[PDB]
Ligand binder design. Structure first.
Ligand SMILES: [Zn+2]
Length: 349
């Protein structure tokens, strides 16, 4: 019995954290690359999580399976295509999906991700391949899909490259730049490479989101909003700790990309306390509901909706409100944004 059986919009979900276990198995076998399990259930049990850890302990799960996908053109295009199929079944009608193109490349990338041998798949090629799979998925499954490229906190030497790829692939299919990775790296938001990329984004009209206040202090959110000039905040739960900052962001209609089930499993949210999203809901904040890394969290979008419905008093009315806010805060051009809003209002009658 689905919590919200109406069209949804999802703004915060990682392509590399939203791959079918079956597809991971497939490419491990095909390429002869080690995976920590030989069945799909056992693979889910080791890659996946069902109790809280930490952000770095979460980030280690990628080490298990990224090597079977990175540097492989067929695999990269396939995960993009299967992503759209996955989301179409969830009742999502518009999604922005994000990833680090560098982390899927095996050429012209330093340091080389996942101990790969030099190949022929550059970060540029990665974006091209993802685009192809996403566009074919859109055609096959009849939902709209756009992508966001992630700078990685520990590797600000990639950030200007990420900016250039966002320019090169603007709206086809890249709609924004993100900053992801380990938020516990002290002061990483203001590493000069990241600041230069975001300032370049401002000058070139490239849209901006930033992971902030997931596990970091409100200062991380402040850094994102006031220096990186972010347009949306990934998570943002800890913003509430600085009341003045939080109230300012409410006043500015900042969008928070909320990931409730993710926040439980990464330890971003202390489950001894009321979730931040309850405050957001009560303050009528601008926010969306999102899966984040459904492969690792063993989840679908219904997991997050069920959780907020059961545990946080979420109504159908609030589910409609937050999806309309998600649509308004999307990085779609004006005409396509209007189209999405029209569709939501039509299907919500
Ligand atoms: Zn994320």
């Amino acid at each position: 019995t689905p919590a919200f059986n109406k069209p949804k919009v999802e703004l915060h979900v990682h392509l590399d954290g939203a791959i079918k276990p079956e597809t991971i198995l497939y490419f491990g076998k095909k390429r002869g690359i080690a995976l920590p399990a030989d069945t799909v259930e056992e693979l889910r049990n080791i890659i996946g999580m069902d109790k809280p850890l930490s952000l770095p302990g979460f980030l280690a799960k990628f080490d298990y399976y990224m090597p079977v996908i990175a540097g492989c053109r067929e695999a990269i295009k396939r995960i993009a295509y299967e992503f759209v199929e996955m989301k179409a079944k969830e009742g999502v009608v518009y999604v922005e999906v994000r990833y680090s193109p560098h982390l899927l490349a095996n050429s012209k990338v330093d340091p080389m991700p996942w101990n790969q041998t030099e190949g022929d798949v550059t970060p540029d090629d990665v974006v091209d391949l993802v685009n192809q799979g996403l566009q074919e998925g859109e055609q096959a499954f009849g939902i709209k899909v756009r992508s966001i490229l992630c700078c990685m906190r520990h590797q600000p030497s990639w950030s200007l490259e990420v900016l250039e790829l966002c320019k090169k692939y603007n709206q086809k299919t890249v709609v924004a730049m993100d900053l992801a990775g380990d938020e516990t790296i002290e002061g990483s938001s203001l590493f000069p490479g990241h600041v230069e990329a975001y300032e370049g984004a401002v000058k070139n009209g490239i849209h901006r989101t930033v992971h902030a206040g997931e596990v970091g202090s409100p200062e991380v959110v402040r850094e994102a909003v006031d220096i990186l000039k972010t347009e949306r905040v990934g998570h943002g739960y800890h913003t509430i700790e600085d009341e003045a900052l939080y109230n300012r962001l409410l006043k500015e209609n900042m969008h928070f990309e909320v990931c409730p089930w993710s926040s439980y499993l990464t330890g971003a949210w202390d489950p001894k306390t009321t979730h931040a999203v309850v405050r957001f809901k009560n303050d009528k904040a601008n926010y969306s509901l999102n899966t984040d890394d459904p492969l690792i969290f063993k989840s679908t979008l219904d997991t997050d909706y069920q959780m907020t419905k059961k545990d946080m008093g979420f109504t159908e009315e609030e589910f409609k409100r937050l999806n309309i806010n998600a649509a308004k805060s999307s990085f779609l051009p004006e005409e396509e944004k209007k189209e999405l809003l029209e569709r939501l209002y039509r299907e919500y009658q």
